[PDB]
Design a protein around this ligand. Sequence first.
Ligand SMILES: *[C@@H]1O[C@H](CO)[C@@H](O)[C@H](O)[C@H]1NC(C)=O
Ligand SMILES: *[C@@H]1O[C@H](CO)[C@@H](O)[C@H](O)[C@H]1NC(C)=O
Lengths: 39, 22
Amino acid sequence: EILDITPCSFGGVSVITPGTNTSNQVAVLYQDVNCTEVP
Amino acid sequence: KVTLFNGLTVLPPLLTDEMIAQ
Ligand SMILES: *[C@@H]1O[C@H](CO)[C@@H](O)[C@H](O)[C@H]1NC(C)=O
Ligand SMILES: *[C@@H]1O[C@H](CO)[C@@H](O)[C@H](O)[C@H]1NC(C)=O
């Protein structure tokens, strides 16, 4: 049986954050990825 | 007219074509 091999999702991680004197809360962006495959 | 893995990644532009048109 013929099977196709595709590498699973990988991509850069970016941290969106206001300056530390403003707040410590951050957000994370996973480039070019299903939101369903993050965990 | 203009129509045309191993760590490669293509980042989308900050301004979409719609915003440039606007
Ligand atoms: C961060 O904010 C405080 C409060 O406004 C300010 O005094 C301080 O200079 C800021 N720190 C930096 C590194 O800009
Ligand atoms: C996200 O994953 C789902 C689950 O397979 C897939 O159908 C979908 O195409 C992915 N999203 C995009 C934008 O391709």
